[PDB]
Design a binder for this molecule. Structure first.
Ligand SMILES: *[C@@H](CC(=O)OCC)[C@H](C[C@@H]1CCNC1=O)NC(=O)[C@H](Cc1ccccc1)NC(=O)[C@@H](Cc1ccc(F)cc1)NC(=O)CCOCC#C
Ligand SMILES: *[C@@H](CC(=O)OCC)[C@H](C[C@@H]1CCNC1=O)NC(=O)[C@H](Cc1ccccc1)NC(=O)[C@@H](Cc1ccc(F)cc1)NC(=O)CCOCC#C
Lengths: 304, 304
């Protein structure tokens, strides 16, 4: 038993990380077969930051303006292109460590692992959710751009996030690996704001199932409610509305515990309305919303 | 900015995980050069559990009673010995992915990453602390024995933990890679109990500095204290006493924030006595004690 903030093993991704330098500017890139993907603002300076003319910047740059290093050894760039907000550097060497992969766009409320990297070298791996406002509550410093988020489905790495920027509220924003931002953000230094964040209800329910599987059951009573009555309560605490699709995906956890989803909803309604009464659940004194139902199934059943 | 429960990149360790089977019992081993390390209770059965006679069980077995698999390739066993509570199986081929490594014995309060594995295949990575009572609060299911904990000192993997068992209180116990248990535990299925657990004070203080670096300051007060007076408060709330060495280890975070350690001690003292009164710190409503001072520096400075 036990329940931890658990990331995917990062080995497959670690072998794909490189550093990409253009002039004075260095960040991280992802080396898959003979292509390196990185944020296109590697070709910018601060003179360009408000209205960068990316096509002009790139056409002034040539294959030799790009320095790509894997570990500490240089790869030769032999071609460059731009796809939305991502640069695609064709290199002379295919990466022999390339895993089976897919580029995916995740949905808000879903989770991924983040390999945080600096100068092409991995620093650490943590678990993040895509917030309903299309930001992530990451841990990133200067130099971390180009770090990627991913899930592992079977033996395929599904890359879903590339890091670009930090908003002044301390939250982070970036693109999928096709270069399109999550949310209403652009890679220019205009003042940008995320909408008001909400709590991811289905994940809270998932984590309360994780608590029952692990023996923390004090909040469980033989209570139940309806979907509509739960949602009237949820919006009062800025929880996202629970749909019957959310109910269905909690099926596996309900199946293993014998607690019907709307019974756990009744428990959650009682926690929002009465508080936690100084108690903890799974070591936390707050309701946690960054474990999906799949996350719970995976580590409460040992998927490998 | 930001702050996450961050684990080390696990790639170097993933390349060391194998499956070890003895009879119908299967768990994980660690393959380094031409030796595989795994818990010795792989050679047991149900009747043995109360008081396994391991020397008898081991001497009676032949190398052919041990099935070691690295992915889908057998490693032939050519020797089988015991060091304390770990079995060492000599195999015919050295691991081509053997990293630079050391076996280290860590102290209570230190953190490490855990690569949870099943049937020799990595499932996930998370961060743990060695509790003052020499247990850990991990996430382990049946089949996870032989999973290892580790730190990375630049390029050297410092293996510090191998997983053996779960106590009935929900916590976990194991050995170092020389086979010696942490704490007073033994690998017999007998009523065993950890001493009273305590909070790791120096770690909470480190996490308060991480909060300040991320702009949470509401809990700061103007008072300073002495180490002697603070330690009287720590004893009252079953916090570990703070040593001058702990103070000095916090020095890099004091250097970054300009807040003296004994001023931050006075802030913690008020938090212990009166709690947080509805407020949060780094998105938590509890004092977190599983980030060491170095963990914080590594995230609030970007060490790779
Ligand atoms: C990655 C850049 C890099 O590695 O290459 C340069 C050597 C960094 C990642 C951040 C640094 C701090 N925390 C991070 O996550 N990205 C930036 O520095 C970007 C560059 C940029 C991207 C898109 C559009 C314009 C510029 N800048 C920022 O993140 C800045 C500026 C900004 C604010 C709001 C917004 F919508 C776009 C850009 N962010 C801040 O300065 C907020 C303060 O917190 C960060 C710090 C310290
Ligand atoms: C790893 C063994 C394995 O992989 O075997 C392959 C067939 C497991 C890891 C645990 C499974 C449950 N939670 C875990 O962390 N280890 C065990 O199953 C050990 C085997 C054992 C090791 C040393 C000495 C005796 C037996 N048994 C347990 O962990 C049991 C029994 C026990 C309790 C207290 C104590 F001090 C020693 C051994 N623990 C429990 O039954 C309580 C937890 O129940 C959760 C379940 C299932």
């Amino acid at each position: 038993s036990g329940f931890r903030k658990m990331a995917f093993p990062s080995g497959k991704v670690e072998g794909c990380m490189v550093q990409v330098t253009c002039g004075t500017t260095t960040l991280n890139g992802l080396w898959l077969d003979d292509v390196v993907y990185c944020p296109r603002h590697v070709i910018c300076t601060s003179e360009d930051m408000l209205n960068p003319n990316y096509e002009d910047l790139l056409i002034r740059k040539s294959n030799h303006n790009f320095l790509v290093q894997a570990g500490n050894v240089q790869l030769r760039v032999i071609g460059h292109s731009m796809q939305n907000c991502v640069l695609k550097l064709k290199v002379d060497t295919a990466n022999p460590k390339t895993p089976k992969y897919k580029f995916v766009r995740i949905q808000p409320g879903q989770t991924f692992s983040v390999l945080a990297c600096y100068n092409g070298s991995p620093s650490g791996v943590y678990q993040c959710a895509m917030r309903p406002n299309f930001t992530i509550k990451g841990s990133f410093l200067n130099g971390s751009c180009g770090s990627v988020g991913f899930n592992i489905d079977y033996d395929c790495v599904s890359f879903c996030y590339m890091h670009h920027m930090e908003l002044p509220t301390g939250v982070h924003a970036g693109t999928d690996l096709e270069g399109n931002f999550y949310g209403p953000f652009v890679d220019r230094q205009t003042a940008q704001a995320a909408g008001t964040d909400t709590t991811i209800t289905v994940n809270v329910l998932a984590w309360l199932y994780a608590a029952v599987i692990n023996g923390d059951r004090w909040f469980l009573n033989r209570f139940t409610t309806t979907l509509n009555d739960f949602n009237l309560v949820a919006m009062k605490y800025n929880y996202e509305p629970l749909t019957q699709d959310h109910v269905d995906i909690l099926g596996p956890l309900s199946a293993q515990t014998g607690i019907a989803v709307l019974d756990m909803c009744a428990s959650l309604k009682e926690l929002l309305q009465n508080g936690m009464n100084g108690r903890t659940i799974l070591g936390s004194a707050l309701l946690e919303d960054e474990f999906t139902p799949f996350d719970v199934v995976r580590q409460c059943s040992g998927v490998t």
